[PDB]
Design a protein around this nucleic acid. Structure first.
Length: 52
DNA sequence: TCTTAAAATCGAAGTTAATATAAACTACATAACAGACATAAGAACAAGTTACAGACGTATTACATAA
């Protein structure tokens, strides 16, 4: 789901020229916008406790 | 006995607050969420059981009155 969201947001960005808003991404995925926001916020890799 | 690569060290506070690249379909089992029922726990009312209080009634004594 994350990978194919990345690819669809890829294609939309390259076709319109700007970062696609979650509403248009949900429209292209045929999935609810709440699910799109859940996927987008799911888990970015934890930052290290030694970052200067 | 003489090179030569490694190994280790190099002042205190003070402040400081992060990022950002890069398969799909299908089949099955399991966990989670919601609803309904039964059960245990508490709230409410009413009754009964019991002794004590509060003022009354009684009993006793002393003063007054009558013979």
């Amino acid at each position: 789901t994350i990978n194919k969201l990345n690819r669809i947001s890829r294609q939309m960005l390259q076709e319109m020229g700007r970062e696609p808003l979650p509403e248009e991404l949900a429209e292209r995925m045929q999935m609810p916008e709440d699910k799109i926001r859940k996927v987008l916020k799911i888990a970015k890799e934890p930052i290290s406790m030694e970052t200067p």
